[PDB]
Amino acid sequence: SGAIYVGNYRVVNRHLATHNDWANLVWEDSSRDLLVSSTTAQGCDTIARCDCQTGVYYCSSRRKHYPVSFSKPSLIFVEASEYYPARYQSHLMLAVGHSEPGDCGGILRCQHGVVGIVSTGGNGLVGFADVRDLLWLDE
């Protein structure tokens, strides 16, 4: 679990979105595993606007933060789960690191702010759904 709170927006993994997220829907993309909903309280997370390929992510299955090198956002093949059939997920970044399904939502951050959230894993890899291209999250 985990979300990003910026301005009047809440960003979560689309497969973990609640009934309230869907009832206050702003934008969703199944191919990215992202959903954005509106909030009444004002969020104060900072979104990174950069091309960093190093950062730190929170891994709830280890109660630890790990420094990682990650790839640029891209179309990567993601095996079937109970939430999606096997498909290509877009805007995905991989790193060598630990990730279990319950780790989705953990934030990846660089010196400029929030880069994205955990979305995939397995085989000693961890995938992050990038949010750096969503410039409207700041306006």
Ligand X SMILES: COc1ccccc1CN1C[C@H](C(N)=O)CCC1=O
- Answer for the pair 76, 89: CB distance below 8 angstroms, yes or no: yes
State in angstroms the smallest separation of the CB of 29 from ligand X.
12
Restricting to residues 93-122, name those near Zn ion by CB under 5 A.
110, 112
> How many angstroms separate the CA atoms of 89 and 84, rounded?
10
Burial, 3: exposed, middle or buried (Cβ in 10 Å; 0-12, 13-18, 19+)? buried
Residue 112: contacted member of ligand X, Zn ion, none (CB under 5 to 8 Å, by partner type)? Zn ion
Restricting to residues 34-63, name those near Zn ion by CB under 5 A.
48, 50, 52
State in angstroms the smallest separation of the CB of 124 from ligand X.
11
User: Could you tell me the two tokens for 36?
Assistant: 């954005």
Binding-site residue positions for Zn(2+):
50, 52, 110, 112
By CB under 6 A, name the binding residues for ligand X. 15, 33, 78, 81, 83-84, 89, 99-101, 103-104, 119-122
State in angstroms the smallest separation of the CB of 127 from ligand X.
7
Residue 33: contacted member of ligand X, Zn ion, none (CB under 5 to 8 Å, by partner type)? ligand X
Cα R_g (the chain), whole angstroms: 14
- 74 Cβ contact list (under 8 Å, min separation 6): 90, 91, 92, 93
Residue with tokens 């109970």: 82
Residues in the site for Zn ion, rule: CB under 5 A? 48, 50, 52, 110, 112
